[PDB]
Design a protein around this ligand. Structure first.
Ligand SMILES: Nc1ncnc2c1ncn2[C@@H]1O[C@H](COP(=O)(O)OP(=O)(O)O)[C@@H](O)[C@H]1O
Length: 263
């Protein structure tokens, strides 16, 4: 998974290049240092995972994909042990290959939740993060965290991520490119208006949009199968309309401004 495979997020692409790629490739050029914690926050299905992997891939760095919910445990002492082990692994990958290591931690807010005092997982995580910054550390390790509930992160936690990037719902023009992108792979009737579809999909995420196209395709595929035909008819505008009547956005009303509030 590469950067060219991601439709929008040109300024996000830039920010991460700036935070990770450039200092990894030219450390001498950052005499004022750089942060090693990047936080991607926003609604789900907006490309957070995608973009983290797309930069690991750009740098050809070592990569560790972690789901924070997976690290947690209903027994004492396992969650902070798991945390310690991930960072250690990374440190060692980095020094062994003499190259940077990227840990992508998805569902970051999970570290703060109650499975069992939750403080002990937090404090270990906070210590590893401060450890990355240490000017005696030989390993070059970066942490890219993602959440769709940033309000669940406390402020000391936020202080370890000195770069913090809001990834929003796609705008009309973003939606149009996503539409163009996903629909390119299926066959459309000339009466189909991407422009109007762009407008009707306000509130919908990038994966929602993919799902809308998939779901529209399925109307024709289903038509072919149930009549035992060879190939399906092209997708028409009404097909999208019927999908839109029944598929509402993954992101409801308030959550959209929980996000802009916190941002
Ligand atoms: N900018 C984008 N361009 C192309 N596809 C996207 C984009 N954003 C999201 N997607 C699609 O949505 C899916 C979910 O994206 P993901 O990176 O997991 O979202 P997040 O991590 O923000 O919850 C991906 O498999 C991809 O199919």
């Amino acid at each position: 998974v590469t950067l060219n495979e991601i439709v929008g997020l040109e300024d996000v692409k830039e920010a991460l290049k700036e935070a990770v790629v450039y200092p990894s490739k030219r450390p001498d050029l950052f005499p004022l240092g750089w942060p090693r914690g990047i936080l991607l926050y926003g609604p789900p299905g907006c490309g957070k995972t995608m973009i983290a992997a797309a930069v690991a891939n750009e740098l050809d760095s070592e990569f560790i994909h972690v789901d924070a919910a997976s690290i947690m445990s209903k027994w004492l002492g396992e969650a902070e042990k798991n945390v310690a082990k991930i960072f250690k692994t990374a440190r060692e990958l980095s020094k062994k290959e003499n190259k940077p290591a990227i840990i992508f931690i998805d569902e970051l807010d999970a570290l703060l939740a109650s499975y069992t005092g939750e403080a002990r997982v937090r404090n270990q995580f906070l210590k590893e993060m401060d450890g990355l910054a240490d000017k005696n550390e030989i390993s070059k390790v970066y942490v890219i965290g993602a959440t769709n509930k940033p309000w669940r992160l406390d402020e000391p936690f936020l202080r370890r991520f000195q770069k913090r990037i809001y990834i929003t719902l796609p705008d009309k023009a973003h939606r149009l490119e996503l539409l163009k992108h996903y629909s390119s792979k299926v066959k459309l009737d000339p009466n189909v208006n991407l422009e109007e579809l762009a407008e009707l999909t306000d509130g919908y995420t990038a994966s929602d949009i993919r799902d809308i196209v998939q779901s529209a395709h399925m109307r024709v595929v289903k038509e072919m199968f149930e009549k035992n035909l060879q190939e399906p008819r092209a997708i028409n505008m009404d097909d999208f309309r019927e999908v839109l009547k029944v598929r509402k956005p993954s992101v409801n009303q308030d959550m959209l401004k929980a996000y802009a509030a916190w941002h």
